[model samples]
Target: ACDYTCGSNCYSSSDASTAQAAGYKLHEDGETVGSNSYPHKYNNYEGFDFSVSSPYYEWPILSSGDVYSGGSPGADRVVFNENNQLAGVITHTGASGNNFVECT
Candidate 1:
C-alpha cells in the first residue's frame, strides 16, 4: 500500500510494474504515444541511485488505475531501463519547474 507517495498520489509496486510493462513494450517496438511521446530518454538529470543503464525511459504512472495511452500524464512517472528493470519513481509535485523528485 502506498509504495510511493508522489505528492497526494498513492502508488503500489504493482502499479509501477503495470505502467512499466506497457511502456517497455512500446520501447521494444520503437513506438511512442502521447503528445510528449513517452518511453523516451530520461537523461537522469536528477542523478538518483539507479543501477540500470544510461538509456533510460520514463512513462506515466497514473493513479487512475489505467495504463497511460496519451493525454495528460499526470505528475507521477515510473522510470525503467532497457531490460525492463525499474530505475525509480519520480514526480514533479515536490520539485521546481522542469525538475523531478524521487518518490519514497
Candidate 2:
C-alpha cells in the first residue's frame, strides 16, 4: 500500500523527505525556482493538521521523481516550515481550483 496517496499517484515517506529537504534548503538560502517562484508562502486555509508551527511554505514535489525547477507545477506539493520540519503533503488533485487537500 502507498504511504501517501496523492490522487492517482503513489508516494512514500522517502519521497516526502527528498522533496522537503530540497525545498527547505532553497528556502533557507532564499532561492526559488519556477514561474510562480516556489518555496512560496503557504497559507493554512485548508486547516489541515501539519503538526508543525505556523509560517509554512509550499514547494513543488513531483510524482515523476523529479524536483521542481520550472514549468507545469503538478497538483501535489511538499509543505515545510522555517524550522526545516516536514509539515505535510498536499495536492490540488482532489480539491477545488488552487485549493489543497491533505495527501493520504
Candidate 3:
C-alpha cells in the first residue's frame, strides 16, 4: 500500500476545461458526467471517450458480466445496451475519443 505521507499530490490531476473540450460534460452536482448507466444515478447516458493508451483499452470482461478495461486497479466496468450502440468503430490514438446519444 502507498504511504499516508504528509506531503504529496497523490492523485493525478486534470482540469475541467480539458475534459470538457474532450467532450465530457460536468454534472449539475459538479462532477463529470458521461455515457453509461450507474443504477442509482438518474442520468443514463450511452457512451464516453476512453483513450486507447488508457490504462483501460484492453480491459477484460469479468465472469460476473462486467466490461472492465486495461490494467486500471479495481473493477472499472462499463456497460452497453443495444439501443446505445457504439457510435462509431473503435479508434486508437494516444488520446482516444468517443461520442454517444440519448438512450431510449
Which rank order by lDDT, best down to worst? 1, 2, 3
Q: Which whole-number lDDT from 0 to 100 does residue 22 have in model 3?
A: 26
Clashes per candidate (backbone, < 3 Å): 0, 0, 4
- Write candidate 3's Cα lDDT for 12-87 as tens digits: 1122122222221222223422233221121223345522222211111122222222232122222222222222
Residue 61 CA displacement from its true place in model 3, Å: 3.9
Cα error, residue 104 of model 1, in Å, equals 1.0
TM-score of each: 0.96, 0.95, 0.16
Backbone clash pairs for candidate 2 read: none
TM-score of candidate 3 against the unseen true structure:
0.16
**Which regions in candidate 2 have their CA more than 4 angstroms from the true location?**
none
Candidate 2 at 3: error in angstroms? 1.1
**Local error of candidate 3 at residue 50 (angstroms):** 7.8
lDDT of 3 at 39: 14
Cα lDDT of model 1 by residue, 1-104, tens digit: 69999999999999999999999999999999999998799998988878777688999999899999999999999999988999899999989998999998
